[PDB]
């Protein structure tokens, strides 16, 4: 029985219940993430920006079943085209807007990766992707508003691939945490 998370802390408790088992009910997880109404005071601790690129700020380690983190996107900051390492990715906007562009998995032959679609994710909306669906790029295209998003990955992963839009060629990337539990981790 899914209830509305009253706060970020409550959300986290509910997520621990939803991931108590070995599988993931994706529609339920998405519904509870969507139902949490972003309250900036609750997540200010985690919203640590960098001038030059987006940051990844760990909020909860999910008892090993998932990682919950907050990503902070300066104006004009965005990601590569990337996969999610055979894991679930849920993304909820906490502040601002992000452009999500979807791409198919490339064929072996070198070719421009043509965007399949795009959407603008607005405050409080939750998107979902996994590798069976495809690849995406996430970008804060705003010139005036920083963006903040809440990401849940299950199982946790710290490596993925970035894809060259000109060719489809992939490279392995190791991701890093800007902070963990509110603490900057150089």
| Site for ligand HCS, rule CB under 6 A | 56, 71, 79, 82, 89, 91, 138, 151, 175
Q: Which residue is nearest to ligand HCS (CB)?
A: 138
Nearer to ligand HCS, 32 or 100 (CB): 100
Binding-site residues sit at 82, 84, 136
Half-sphere exposure (Cβ direction) of 72: Cα atoms closer than 13 Å: 19
Q: Of the candidates 30, 15, 118, which has an alpha carbon nearest to the alpha carbon of residue 68?
A: 15
In sign, the C-alpha dihedral spanning 85, 59, 47, 55 is negative
52 vs 106, 137, 161, CA distance in Å?
29, 17, 21
Binding-site residues for Fe cation sit at 82, 84, 136
- Shortest distance, position 131 Cβ to ligand HCS, whole Å: 12
Nearer to ligand HCS, 71 or 93 (CB): 71
Residue 22's SS3 state is coil
Nearer to ligand HCS, 68 or 138 (CB): 138
Q: Strand (E) positions, the chain?
A: 55-60, 67-73, 81-82, 88-95, 98-103, 117-121, 126-129, 135-139, 147-154, 159-163, 170-174, 179-180, 183-184
Cα separation, 170 vs 160, whole angstroms: 10
- Shortest distance, position 91 Cβ to ligand HCS, whole Å: 6
- Shortest distance, position 1 Cβ to ligand HCS, whole Å: 29
- Shortest distance, position 3 Cβ to ligand HCS, whole Å: 26
- Shortest distance, position 89 Cβ to ligand HCS, whole Å: 5
Nearer to ligand HCS, 2 or 128 (CB): 128
Nearer to ligand HCS, 32 or 89 (CB): 89
């Amino acid at each position: 029985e899914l209830l509305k998370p009253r706060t970020l802390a409550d959300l986290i408790r509910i997520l621990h219940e939803l991931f108590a088992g070995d599988e993931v009910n994706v529609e339920e997880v998405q519904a509870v993430l969507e139902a949490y109404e972003s309250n900036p005071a609750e997540w200010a601790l985690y919203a640590k920006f960098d001038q030059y690129r987006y940051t990844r700020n760990l909020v909860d380690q999910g008892n090993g079943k998932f990682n919950l983190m907050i990503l902070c996107w300066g104006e004009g900051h965005g990601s590569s085209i990337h996969d999610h390492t055979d894991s679930h990715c849920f993304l909820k906007l906490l502040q601002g807007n992000l452009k999500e562009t979807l791409f198919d998995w490339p064929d072996k032959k070198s070719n421009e990766m043509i965007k399949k679609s795009e959407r603008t994710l607005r405050e409080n909306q939750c998107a979902y992707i996994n590798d069976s669906i495809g690849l995406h790029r996430v970008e804060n295209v705003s010139h005036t508003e920083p963006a903040v998003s809440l990401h849940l990955f299950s199982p946790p992963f710290d490596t993925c691939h970035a894809f060259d839009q000109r060719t489809g060629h992939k490279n392995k990337v190791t991701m890093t945490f800007h902070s963990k539990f509110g603490i900057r981790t150089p």
